[PDB]
Design a protein around this ligand. Structure first.
Ligand SMILES: [Zn+2]
Length: 291
């Protein structure tokens, strides 16, 4: 079917228009209703995991993991996921005055949700043969900031850790999983992420092959990228479900992400419909080609 990059663009704009999706803010709460409501409008049976999660600083985060289960009676299922919270710190900003102030997270948060929001629209209009679980993970981007010296493990991906050990349905199972992260920036290039190739090799090939078949090899690069801490690591760990990350890899930065990453430059100004189009068209092709 047709992926509407313009609609996925408006869904990103709608989230960011709330203000930053920082856990324990009202903008976060209004956005939680908005995301779950849209999933339900497009035929999903919606599950909201409310969990009080502890950030690196000991703060209790009132998180919502949002699960849209499509055709929930189908036993053969694919997991599509992304994080929806916005980081509380622009801790890589060039202005130190912004280091403890939140980011809009248009690309880091908004893009991966927005694409999956249009997917929900498309699969309500043309039901796929397989079941689809759309999962929006909370409290992914609240990890220890650069301006804190002490290291603690697993302070990122707080929501995906909870769900992976506490699924929304008992014995939840997916054939494989596809994570979308920072999938809207102008000039994005998604290299094959190392954790993905390790545990989801057959599906990295599935996604990268389909992407080139559709003409999106300029986006899905046939080369290896970084080893990345992301939500797909904790779903792999917890369910042993093979998961891949479609995540921007920027080889020119020290961090490996776009220059706006964890800055207040992560706004709608960077979102590229053609980047959105590539990712959305590719995933729609693969899921409808699952039997
Ligand atoms: Zn982030």
């Amino acid at each position: 079917p047709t992926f509407n990059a313009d609609s996925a663009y408006a869904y990103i704009e709608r989230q960011v228009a709330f203000g930053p999706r920082v856990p324990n803010t009202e903008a976060h709460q209004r956005c939680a209703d908005y995301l779950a409501g849209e999933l339900d409008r497009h035929g999903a049976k919606v599950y909201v995991q409310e969990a009080v999660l502890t950030a690196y600083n000991g703060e209790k985060l009132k998180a919502q993991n949002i699960v849209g289960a499509f055709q929930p009676e189908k036993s053969r299922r694919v997991l599509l996921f992304a994080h929806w919270d916005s980081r509380p710190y622009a801790d890589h900003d060039t202005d130190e005055a912004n280091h403890r102030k939140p980011i809009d997270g248009a690309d880091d948060g908004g893009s991966g949700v927005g694409i999956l929001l249009e997917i929900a629209r498309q699969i309500q209009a043309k039901a796929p043969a397989i079941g689809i679980d759309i999962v929006f993970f909370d409290a992914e981007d609240y990890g220890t900031p650069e301006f804190v010296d002490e290291y603690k493990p697993d302070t990122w991906c707080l929501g995906s850790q909870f769900w992976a050990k506490n699924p929304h349905v008992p014995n939840y199972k997916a054939e494989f999983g596809i994570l979308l992260d920072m999938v809207g920036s102008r000039g994005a290039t998604f290299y094959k992420e190392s954790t993905s190739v390790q545990y989801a090799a057959r599906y990295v090939e599935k996604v990268w092959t389909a992407a080139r078949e559709l003409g999106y090899g300029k986006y899905f690069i046939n080369a290896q990228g970084g080893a990345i801490v992301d939500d797909h690591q904790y779903v792999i760990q917890g369910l042993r479900t093979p998961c891949l990350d479609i995540i921007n890899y920027d080889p020119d930065t020290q961090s490996g992400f776009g220059p706006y990453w964890h800055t207040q430059n992560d706004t709608m100004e960077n979102i590229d419909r053609e980047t959105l189009k590539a990712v959305g068209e590719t995933i729609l092709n693969v899921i409808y080609n699952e039997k």
